[PDB]
Design a protein around this ligand. Structure first.
Ligand SMILES: Nc1c(C(=O)O)ccc(Cl)c1O
Ligand SMILES: Nc1c(C(=O)O)ccc(Cl)c1O
Ligand SMILES: [Fe+3]
Ligand SMILES: [Fe+3]
Ligand SMILES: [Fe+3]
Ligand SMILES: [Fe+3]
Lengths: 174, 174
């Protein structure tokens, strides 16, 4: 049987769940308990973290503009997602999605991570660019597991303290 | 590094490769050698086969209309893909994509199949609806491996002969 239901108009679905896309992630999963994690992400979001996904991530910026802050070698990069753009991210490339515009919508498709394959969430220093803190987690829900992790980073100056130059990361204000 | 390149406008990409989408599949893969198999499928295609994918398949009918002939229990069903519709197909649900309109375009995303996980391609009888022929293959390319398989079915009345009522499947004319 069609465990995930019949086909349905996507633009309409987005219009109807627009009000449900809220910070910090701006996340909303389309189907539950599926191998393909299909989500729509809107704005304005609030991400100061760099995600380290063990698998690839597909992007299709349907509405509005957004961009991904990245690290390509050891340098911070910016990959813009102009409305209409699609993009496939190689596994493990560090990325921090910046979605500043309201009414924005990007289709993001990922995969359920196999047991033992963990996701990483990182923060780097503004000053020396050194790694400040990293949390590895067996990701069970890209919609609910995230906010709690960030909150623990923001609630601790010890986690935010750069082990290289001692600078304390701005927390939820960077 | 961005092994798959930078983001790019999708509508434009489709406009530029429109002429490359041809029968029987109407297939075109966006990125090569990736875990996520991202393809755009246009029309008019020519499919008389039912695909048995061991993994899920994501659909997003971007341009035009199409439909999937299915089997939901033992009955032939039809799941329409109206322009704008998205759909996630559970693994193994038998489906035969019918894409009759030219200039049509549907985003189809699947996964690279792990060794040992085979794909099935089937044909059923018009008369008794019984299974007429099934080929299992370690799918290495949903863009090039398909046509050769179908051609062998069409070139053999023995493969097309229903083991239940003896009716010979119409081949590439059903
Ligand atoms: N790319 C994202 C995004 C995003 O693109 O906004 C949000 C959540 C997660 Cl888990 C991601 O991997
Ligand atoms: N759904 C499809 C389609 C399709 O939707 O047209 C084409 C090729 C393959 Cl291998 C598929 O699984
Ligand atoms: Fe990510
Ligand atoms: Fe520092
Ligand atoms: Fe299929
Ligand atoms: Fe028959």
């Amino acid at each position: 049987m069609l465990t995930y239901g019949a086909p349905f108009n996507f633009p309409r679905w987005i219009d109807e769940h627009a009000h449900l896309l809220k910070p910090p992630v701006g996340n909303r999963q389309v189907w539950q308990d599926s191998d393909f994690i299909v989500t729509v992400v809107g704005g304005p979001n609030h991400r100061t973290d760099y995600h380290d996904d063990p698998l690839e991530e597909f992007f299709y910026q349907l509405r509005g503009n957004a961009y991904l802050n990245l690290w390509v070698d050891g340098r911070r990069e910016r990959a813009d997602l102009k409305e209409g753009d699609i993009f496939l991210l190689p596994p493990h490339v560090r990325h921090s999605p910046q979605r500043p515009e309201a009414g924005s919508a990007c289709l993001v498709i990922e995969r359920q991570r196999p047991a033992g394959m963990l996701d990483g969430f990182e923060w780097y220093c503004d000053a020396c660019g050194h790694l400040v803190h990293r949390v590895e987690v067996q990701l069970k829900s890209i919609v609910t597991d995230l906010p709690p992790l960030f909150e623990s980073f923001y609630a601790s100056e010890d986690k935010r303290r750069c082990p290289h130059c001692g600078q304390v990361h701005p927390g939820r204000a960077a």
